[PDB]
Amino acid sequence: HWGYGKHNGPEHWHKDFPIAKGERQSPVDIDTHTAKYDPSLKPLSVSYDQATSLRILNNGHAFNVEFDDSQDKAVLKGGPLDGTYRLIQFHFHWGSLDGQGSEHTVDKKKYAAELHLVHWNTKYGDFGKAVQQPDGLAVLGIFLKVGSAKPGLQKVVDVLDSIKTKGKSADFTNFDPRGLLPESLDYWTYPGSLTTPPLLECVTWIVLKEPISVSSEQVLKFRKLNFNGEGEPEELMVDNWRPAQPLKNRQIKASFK
Numbered sequence: 226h227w228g229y230g231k232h233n234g235p236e237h238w239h240k241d242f243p244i245a246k247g248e249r250q251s252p253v254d255i256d257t258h259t260a261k262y263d264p265s266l267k268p269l270s271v272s273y274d275q276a277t278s279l280r281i282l283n284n285g286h287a288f289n290v291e292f293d294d295s296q297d298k299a300v301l302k303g304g305p306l307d308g309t310y311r312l313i314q315f316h317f318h319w320g321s322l323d324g325q326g327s328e329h330t331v332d333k334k335k336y337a338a339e340l341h342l343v344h345w346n347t348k349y350g351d352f353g354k355a356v357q358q359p360d361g362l363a364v365l366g367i368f369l370k371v372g373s374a375k376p377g378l379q380k381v382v383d384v385l386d387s388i389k390t391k392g393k394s395a396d397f398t399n400f401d402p403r404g405l406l407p408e409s410l411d412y413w414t415y416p417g418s419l420t421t422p423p424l425l426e427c428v429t430w431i432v433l434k435e436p437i438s439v440s441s442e443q444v445l446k447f448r449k450l451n452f453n454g455e456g457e458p459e460e461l462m463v464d465n466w467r468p469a470q471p472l473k474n475r476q477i478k479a480s481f482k
């Protein structure tokens with residue numbers, strides 16, 4: 226089964242998931258000088274005031290903070306999107322060292338981590354149907370750099386001890402994801418894919434230009450999680466990122482000049 230190690234990591238995924246070598250795979254390097262400003266792109270509309278977080282889960286590859294997506298409570302619209310996309314979960318990718326961890330790169334620069342807020346297009350009725358469509362998902366990606374602490378991240382950091390190992394979950398109600406956003410919603414956008422198996426080509430990516438800052442102590446706590454289940458030999462959950470994939474026949478558009 227797939228993972229991030231030498232023997233089951235990103236270079237092996239194509240054997241079980243051939244679409245790994247497809248025409249719209251993610252992540253990609255964002256070459257800032259080649260991205261095209263698109264004046265027709267609208268501002269993002271991030272409406273998270275009624276978000277209902279439920280649970281946090283260590284799934285053996287990352288941790289997911291899950292939301293109630295049975296009603297339009299936390300939605301993303303605008304930008305490149307047509308229609309309404311409901312927030313289902315967010316998760317991160319991070320490194321073993323502060324100089325790596327992000328999936329997207331910016332002029333080949335790697336950030337320490339990357340946050341993915343995953344949303345699905347309500348015209349497809351449920352997430353499982355949405356992932357089978359080329360416009361099924363919208364993922365908002367936010368870079369993390371190490372510097373000052375992010376206060377809105379601390380509640381996530383402090384629960385990680387309770388979900389150390391694969392398959393553990395904990396109640397995670399009343400978390401406000403607005404506390405994870407940077408000031409600016411300027412963004413780049415391109416058509417891509419899930420970045421873990423099954424690697425489905427169903428995502429409109431919206432990557433914010435402005436990173437958030439988190440403290441060294443906050444990211445250190447991410448690195449204490451485990452890929453393994455309880456009672457198995459400890460394997461630290463680090464370097465759970467897929468590297469940049471070929472851009473192929475795609476253009477990255479910028480919302481800003």
Ligand SMILES: CCn1cc(-c2cc(C(=O)O)n(C)n2)c2ccccc21
Nearest residue numbers: 341343353356418419420421422423
């Ligand atoms: C582990 C199997 N699996 C993993 C995912 C998945 C992978 C990702 C991702 O790369 O962010 N998401 C948001 N969801 C998935 C989606 C539909 C059906 C099965 C899936």
Ligand SMILES: [Zn+2]
Nearest residue numbers: 316318341420
């Ligand atoms: Zn992700």
